[PDB]
């Protein structure tokens, strides 16, 4: 009978923009509703809950959610997306007077505002003795995404965002590597659509 639905396993928001994470429920009688967050590597933390009191529920850190019976909704929102908001969010609902049932979760990805992109592919060498290397594609903006490798002997990671607090500076990167003799960083990302102005040093 009773369920809870979250729309999209992974969602994006631009840094600074409105956060919206959507939850809908299927109970005929209004249930209690809960929003939990799971920050990287950790357990569950309650953000807010609807417990048949106020319909506009306020939570920790600027989060809020409005219970709307007529659209069976309880969408979570925060006015401005910060890099620290990157986490997985779970909507949950009371069921059978005896338990909480959880939605499937939505991971929020925050797209950093990269005002001065400087896309580049660099070659890095092992700190130990080595003709061993990796390739680093870095400093591209939000419009670039990285594709998986077409060569089973070339490994390419998803893009990852780092936040250098020392310089208040965020950047995207992906890493590629191979044991192959004919692997060159100039070709590592040939299955990705990269910026036309990507820097390829020497």
């Amino acid at each position: 009978a009773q369920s809870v639905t979250q729309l999209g396993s992974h969602v994006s928001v631009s840094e600074g923009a409105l956060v919206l994470l959507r939850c809908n429920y299927s109970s005929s009688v209004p249930p209690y509703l809960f929003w939990y967050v799971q920050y990287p590597n950790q357990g569950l933390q309650l953000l807010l809950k609807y417990t048949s009191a106020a319909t506009l529920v306020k939570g920790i850190n600027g989060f809020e959610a409005e219970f709307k019976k007529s659209e069976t909704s309880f969408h979570l929102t925060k006015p401005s997306a910060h890099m620290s908001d990157a986490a997985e969010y779970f909507c949950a609902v009371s069921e059978q007077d005896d338990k909480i049932i959880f939605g499937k979760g939505t991971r929020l990805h925050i797209l950093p505002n990269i005002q001065n992109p400087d896309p580049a592919v660099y070659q890095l060498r092992d700190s130990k003795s080595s003709d061993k290397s990796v390739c680093l594609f870095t400093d591209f903006d939000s419009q670039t995404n990285v594709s998986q490798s077409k060569d089973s002997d070339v490994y390419i990671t998803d893009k990852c965002v780092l936040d250098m607090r020392s310089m208040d500076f965020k950047s995207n990167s992906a890493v590629a590597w191979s044991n192959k003799s004919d692997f060159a960083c100039a070709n590592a990302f040939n299955n990705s659509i990269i910026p036309e102005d990507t820097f390829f040093p020497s």
Partner: protein, 240 residues
């Protein structure tokens, strides 16, 4: 409600009975065992309202439970199989849906312990071209050849853990994706200013905590027994 769970991490072979124990201090009637899996959220296994009361949740098959005391709720994998690999959470509730979760048990079930293998870990030093172009310096750590996928990667600068400037892939990749027991690899980046990399006094270490075999486990191979262990790699800053 200091809700506590044991164990925190465990690797087991298939076909073994495994127990996970939940204890609380507030004596709430209601206790729960859930599993978390990517894309599925938290799914309820079993729950209990008193020592005499056991109720199936959505995914009770392959599990049993016992409510040994007001304070204690035990979960058993009856005969562990690989699809029981998961993060397991116990919870308690008061009579108004006030839930308290335990901190989790990360359980991996593998078919064959002979395939367990610690990572090789290497640090790759920053590119001179990055340094010249950006006045920043990105170190890359690469952990390769490990099984199962049950690791924790951290960076340590001058002996202290750092979080700033770090990005670690959220999941390892399979080195041989067509294989059910493929080994895994994981990368991470630590970015610092060029001047901080250029100081030969600064020390950079990538640490990988690997979870594998215990002292209890039989080992019949010539290669090193793949016990739970830390594997690191390091680099010193460099003016040239």
């Amino acid at each position: 409600a200091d809700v506590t769970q044991t164990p925190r991490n465990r690797i087991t072979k298939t076909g073994k009975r495994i127990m996970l124990e939940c204890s609380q201090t507030k004596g709430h009637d209601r206790m729960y065992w859930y599993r978390q899996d990517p894309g599925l959220g938290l799914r309820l296994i079993y729950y209990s309202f008193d020592v005499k009361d056991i109720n199936k949740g959505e995914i009770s098959d392959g599990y049993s439970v016992s409510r040994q005391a007001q304070a204690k709720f035990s979960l058993s994998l009856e005969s562990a199989i690989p699809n029981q690999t998961a993060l397991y959470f116990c919870a308690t509730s008061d009579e108004s849906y006030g839930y308290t979760f335990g901190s989790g048990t990360r359980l991996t079930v593998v078919e064959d312990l002979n395939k367990v293998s610690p990572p090789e870990v290497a640090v790759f030093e920053p590119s001179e071209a990055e340094i010249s172009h950006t006045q920043k310096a990105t170190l890359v750590c690469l952990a390769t050849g490990f099984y199962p996928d049950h690791v924790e990667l951290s960076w340590w600068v001058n002996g202290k853990e750092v979080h700033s400037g770090v990005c670690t892939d959220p999941q390892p990749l399979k080195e041989q994706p067509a294989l059910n027991d493929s080994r895994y690899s994981l990368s991470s980046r630590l970015r610092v200013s060029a001047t901080f990399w250029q100081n030969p006094r600064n020390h950079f270490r990538c640490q990988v905590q690997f979870y594998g075999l215990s002292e209890n486990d039989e080992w019949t191979q010539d290669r090193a027994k793949p016990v739970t262990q830390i594997v690191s790699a390091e680099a010193w800053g460099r003016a040239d």
